[PDB]
Amino acid sequence: PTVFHKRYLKKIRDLGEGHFGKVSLYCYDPTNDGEMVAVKALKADCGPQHRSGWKQEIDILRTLYHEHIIKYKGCCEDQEKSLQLVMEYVPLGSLRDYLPRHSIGLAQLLLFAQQICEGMAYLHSQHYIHRNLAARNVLLDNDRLVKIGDFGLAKAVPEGHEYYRVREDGDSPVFWYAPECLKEYKFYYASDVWSFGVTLYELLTHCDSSQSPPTKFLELIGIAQGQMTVLRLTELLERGERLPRPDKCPCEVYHLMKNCWETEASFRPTFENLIPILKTVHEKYRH
Ligand SMILES: O=C(Nc1nnc(Sc2ccnc3cc(Cl)ccc23)s1)c1cccs1
């Protein structure tokens, strides 16, 4: 029932450096005696009705619940032609910022991966694709539980269809994307698994920038971060080239990543399949 009024939100601090756009930590103290929340300011000068249509769409995300998916709390308009999106505050933040500055063993990294899969399996079973699964978008709470964030690309998959058709050739996170996404503009549940493979790669490199997928992929092609084309990447992937085995990364775990990187969407493992395979692997490496 909670509706959020701009007159009871006191700004504490910016969040995420700049990597999530303009997100800030607020205190919500209405009665003046208060909960902590993150607020995303969203430019929405697109005509009043288009703006409402986006609110309706965002609002539907609130009907999702899973402990490894961030909780979107509400979407208010500032009619200043912008939308204010209120969500739970996830205090340790992004794995991309967290993993470099903390000692985290193989068992714990595998535990993160199983949590992500569990949140993604739920999402898939609710008939949604995420389209933006990367380590930057996986947040960590205080008990080191994963919460998947940034649903700014998420989409309901239409009844009777096994893919969503991406329109628009815009800013794409291409280095996390399956070839069917890159070439044909089709996004399947199986395409989110490809992105998982890349996220798994990320964790096991400890989100080391120099081993990062854009860095690595540009090197395997040859040319620099500026001459880069989707076409050049697609061809490399078809020829069967892949991101390399990360340092100290077990061969069964790498094979996992490679299974997520099968060219043919249909032969990739499902999240629901990946959960137990990751439970089993984590058991070998715990304690
Ligand atoms: O923007 C969105 N979704 C986000 N989902 N997660 C974000 S970032 C963040 C959240 C909570 N807590 C945080 C804590 C720290 Cl330290 C750093 C960042 C966060 S923005 C959108 C969702 C849908 C449309 S747009």
Curated annotation (Swiss-Prot):
Residues 9-285 form the Protein kinase domain. The modification Phosphotyrosine is found at residues 163-164. Changing residue 40 to R: Complete loss of catalytic activity. ATP binds at residues 15-23, 40. The active site is at 132 (proton acceptor). Phosphorylated. Phosphorylation by JAK1 at Tyr-163 and Tyr-164 induces kinase activation. Observed in all cell lines analyzed. Expressed in a variety of lymphoid and non-lymphoid cell lines. Interacts (via FERM domain) with JAKMIP1. Interacts with PIK3R1; this interaction is important for cell migration. Interacts with MPL/TPOR. Belongs to the protein kinase superfamily. Tyr protein kinase family. JAK subfamily. It is linked to Immunodeficiency 35: A primary immunodeficiency characterized by recurrent skin abscesses, pneumonia, and highly elevated serum IgE. Tyrosine kinase of the non-receptor type involved in numerous cytokines and interferons signaling, which regulates cell growth, development, cell migration, innate and adaptive immunity. Plays both structural and catalytic roles in numerous interleukins and interferons (IFN-alpha/beta) signaling. Associates with heterodimeric cytokine receptor complexes and activates STAT family members including STAT1, STAT3, STAT4 or STAT6. This is Non-receptor tyrosine-protein kinase TYK2. It comes from Homo sapiens.
